[PDB]
Design an enzyme around this catalytic site. Sequence first.
Site, short mmCIF file in Angstrom:
data_model
loop_
_atom_site.label_atom_id
_atom_site.label_comp_id
_atom_site.label_asym_id
_atom_site.label_seq_id
_atom_site.Cartn_x
_atom_site.Cartn_y
_atom_site.Cartn_z
CB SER A 93 -15.19 -11.54 -22.63
OG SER A 93 -14.07 -11.33 -21.78
CE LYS B 51 -14.66 -9.21 -26.61
NZ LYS B 51 -14.58 -10.37 -25.69
#
Lengths: 144, 72
Positions: free
Chosen positions: A101, A144
């Site tokens: 990520s 996130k």
Amino acid sequence: LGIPRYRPDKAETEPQVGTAQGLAWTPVGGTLLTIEVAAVPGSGKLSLTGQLGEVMKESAQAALTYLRAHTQDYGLPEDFYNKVDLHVHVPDGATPKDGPSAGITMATAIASALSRRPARMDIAMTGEVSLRGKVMPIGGVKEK
Amino acid sequence: DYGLPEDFYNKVDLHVHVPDGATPKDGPSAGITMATAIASALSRRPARMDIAMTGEVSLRGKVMPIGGVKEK
């Protein structure tokens, strides 16, 4: 209460010479994972530490192929792959949540360190990458 | 014969990733995919649009068969 151990509302975070400020979507809690890289002169290795799984490596070399396609586009030399070492530690990587990520966080880290130019304070960012450079979609964009 | 720079395996690095392989893989079934992918990359040239495929590449240039193609 006691003294400020943390920074204020973040307008003072020192521009990082090579240190990106990556997102964390973690069992331990969302935070920044500031990945640092030792811009060290060697004979071209590029090693990664920090209890880290392999998808973090593959995102790092995806950013690396994107970097070497853009050597003249940034501060990189004509052929940096054989001359410079980059120890790439990550602070907290023993995470089966954490897939690849932060390859763009890797990218900002590596280009900021090799360029010797400030990776930005306070852009907390995430996203899985392609090799050729297209920022792939991610799920879990909530955390996130 | 496909317009290549004839110096491509001596001074041109090339980096390959596939999102699988750590999956248990039933032999070769994307060698032609790697063939067209690398040939597409080595001349800055896109492959075709919305087309699936599977197969194997032999040494001479013949597409060897692969088994159980009902699945793919």
